[PDB]
Structure formats: C-alpha cells, structure tokens
Amino acid sequence: NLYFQSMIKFVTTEINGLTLRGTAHVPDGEPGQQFPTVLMFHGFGAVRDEGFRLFIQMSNRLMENGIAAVRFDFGCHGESDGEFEDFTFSQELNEGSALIDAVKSMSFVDSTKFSLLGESLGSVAASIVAGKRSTELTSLCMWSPAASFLDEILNDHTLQGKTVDNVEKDGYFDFYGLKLGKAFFDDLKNINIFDNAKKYQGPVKIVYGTNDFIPEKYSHKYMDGYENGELVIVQDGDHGWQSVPSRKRILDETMKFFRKTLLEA
Amino acid sequence: SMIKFVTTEINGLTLRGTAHVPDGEPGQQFPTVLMFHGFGAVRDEGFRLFIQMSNRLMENGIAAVRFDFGCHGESDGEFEDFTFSQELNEGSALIDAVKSMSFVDSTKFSLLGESLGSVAASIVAGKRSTELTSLCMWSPAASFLDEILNDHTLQGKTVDNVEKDGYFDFYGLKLGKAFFDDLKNINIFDNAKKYQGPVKIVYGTNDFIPEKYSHKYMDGYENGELVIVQDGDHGWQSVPSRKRILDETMKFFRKTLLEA
C-alpha cells in the first residue's frame, strides 16, 4: 500500500563552475525504494531530449519498467551553463565522470545498479568515462557511436562534412549557428577513445544502424577491445533512429539490454 | 537571475516548460515573453535558439517562458494524437497560465514564435488580442496548410500514404490521421489580421518558406514591421544570422515591453 506514482522532475548539479541542467524520470515505487538507473549522454551540439524525442521515449520506457532514467545537458549544451565557443571534449569527459558521482548521490538511485547510455558522440564519451570509471557501471549501451570524430576532424579536416580549415581565419567554426571555438579543436589531440574504452570489462551493447554515416568499422574496433561486448546491427537503421520502425527497434533492444543487466542481475 | 522549471495541465496533459526569471527585488514582477516552438520541435528550439533568446531577454529584465507543446518534447502526449487545433488551444491556455505566474507582469506580456510556432502565435494573438502587448514571429511556417492540403507533402515527403500506413513518419515519430483530418479546421490569416498591436516578422532570404506568406501577414497587420535578413535561414543556423535574430528580437521587445 506504500506507493507513489512515477514522476518526471528537473534536476541540476554543479561541475567546475557550470550548472548542468537535467531531467530525471523516476518509476512508481515505495518510499525509500532505490531504482536501477540509466544515465544518458546526448551527442554533439545536441540536448538532453536528443533528436525527435529519442531520449524522452527511452527515458519513459525505462521508467515504466522500474528503471530510473537521468539525462543532463552537457556543459555548453542545451539549458546548461557554458558558451559553445568554450566547449571542449575533455570538459565533456570530466563532466560525464562527475555526473556519475552526482547521480549516484541522488537518493532514488541504486548505486549498485547504474549504467550509461549514449547516442552519437555521447556514446564515445560514455565509452571513455566507462573505461576511467570502470567499477562504477553495471553496464554500458552505445547507440550509433560517433567514434570517427577524431579521424574526421584531424585527418579528413571536416566536421560533419564541413571543412575545419577556416577556423584560424574566421576565428571560430560555425555549427548550425553556434560558435564552436578554437579550444575544441586544440583539445582533440588529448582524446584516446579505444585505449580508454577497452578498460571497461562489464557488459557492453552497441547498436548500429546500416544507414549510419559513421563507418561500421568503428563499432567493430570497440568490439575488439571489449571482453563482454554485443553488437546489434539494425537493418535500415540510421544514425538518429529517425524512422518509426528503427525507433521502435532501438527502444526495444535497449530495454532488453537494461532489463538483462539491471533488473535480472 | 534563475532558470526555473514550470508545469501546467491543459486538457489532461501536463505541459513542461522552462522559465528564465530576471534578477530583481523580492516580490518583483517582470514583462514576459512566451515562446512557441515549431512542428515536432522542443522548447529549446534548434541548436539553442530559444535558450539564447531567453537568456538575452532575462539579462535585460524580461522574463522568458517556453513550454513543450502537448505531444512535443517532455510534455505529455503521443505525437500520433497531435493536432494543430490542440496546439492553438494550448497556446491560448498558456497565455492565462503564464500570466497567472507570480513573476509575470500580466500587463506587459508578449508572444514569440519560430516556424509553426509563429503560425500558432499569429492565430492566438488574433483571438486573444487584448492579452498581448506585442507579437514577434520568426520564419513563420504559414505555408503549411497549402503544402499539405494542396501539394500533398509535409516538409517534402508525401502525405498520400497516411491512410494506407496508418500514420505519417516524421523523423521516427508517428504522426497520426487526426492531425491531417484536423487541418480543415485551421484558418491562419483571417484570425491573424485581428491583432492590432505591434508585430515584428523576421524572415531570412534563405528560408524555404516563400517570402510571400510574410507579406500576406503584413497586409493584415495595422502595426506590422517586416525585417528581411540577407542570408538568414529558417532556423537562424549561421553565427551571423543567429546574432541578427537575437539582436532584432531584443530590440523589438525592449521597445514594446521595456519602453512603452
């Protein structure tokens, strides 16, 4: 009889002087109950909803099945503090690690049943944070990892197909009307995706859609380094799961994974 | 200043929003801009657009409030159940709900729209004209009835398979038959022309919406201003056009909410 209904509430935390703003979906439960929890990392220049309600749908699916879902705007993204011109991926990694501690400190979170979910660059961040905080995560799920982003910018000299070679001349990179700064580009040399990601030995699921513009080889590279990886290739899935059939599939595959790793273990 | 999260219930749906409240004395109220996002968008709008506008207003003493419409973003409701009529109902109800908020000066209250949100704002303003100090519309998607009903496309994709498939696929969201059946109920320009307050429309020359729709609005506004931004696009998705849209809009709301 002890019972409260599910709730969608807004949460904040402070990391390195920035207020990060987020949404928590807490399942139905009893007072004092703690829930297995999935912390979601959005992609580059994205927001915590992700594209076309993607993380919202995933959050509510988890909530309806007894798994709490938490998702923040990264620093310099969405409603969190920070100018895009100051964004660096190293800062995103620092924040992702700090968000594990912040979210585990929330009273409704079962710290022993805590996982990461990523989309696009958020999957890359999740893979690196998982390697550096390996004992903190029950499992790791990565959608459409944008693990080519260093190769693309540093070797192909483009960012989502647009040249990066005018940054010094113009003073910035124009990302859909946001000003991306020199600091982002100068920091890229510091990132090592796969050497760090392979340190995580827990259950990993990667979901890759055959229409993803990221080459499939990057998902296979992850798998080479994972002791307990599963790679699901979704026929006609795309990078953001932007068809009704592939959206249903990504929600199902992910709920299946977190049921197995968080609810049945 | 402070960024607060607000909710209101309309027709059984909880709408979820963000309020940017300026710094002030305890008990102070502020002129307020209520922002309407576009079709299948969220209350941030694309690439931080509404967030940037909200903080610009907040820093200048104007409170900014922006909700996810029903069936959008974090608000309740499935996209398959979305209709424009219920967006118009929610937009009207949001005027009353936001005016009832503690920090909102109900006498200095305006609407801002982007894309379909501008169309909704134009209709609600025409129908609730005494409630609004001013109206600003970015990139109004006022061709949307013509495109769907006459050209049988929705952002370039056919709508002629909806009956057979049971839905329209909008970037992985199921849009339902209810949306299309409801389009016959919608009148843009005869509603919009009723509003006599100051209106500003900002239109970018790279907008895929034909410029003629903004001129049609102007023909019906007694106090309209049309700004054409060279090389601006529908979502203000270049750094120069983003600076321009924020500046033009701050200027308009300074004039209409801070200096009137």
Residue numbers in the entry:
A (entry chain A): -5 to 259
B (entry chain B): 0 to 259
Manuscript excerpt for this entry:
Here, we report the crystal structure and biochemical characterization of a feruloyl esterase (LbFAE) from Lentilactobacillus buchneri, a LAB strain that has been used as a silage additive. The LbFAE monomer structure includes 260 amino acids that forms the canonical α/β-hydrolase superfamily fold with a conserved Ser-His-Asp catalytic triad. The protein forms a homodimer with two-fold symmetry where the active sites from the two monomers are oriented facing each other. The two subunits associate to restrict access to the active site such that only single FA chains attached to arabinoxylan can be accommodated, an arrangement that excludes access to FA cross-links between arabinoxylan chains.
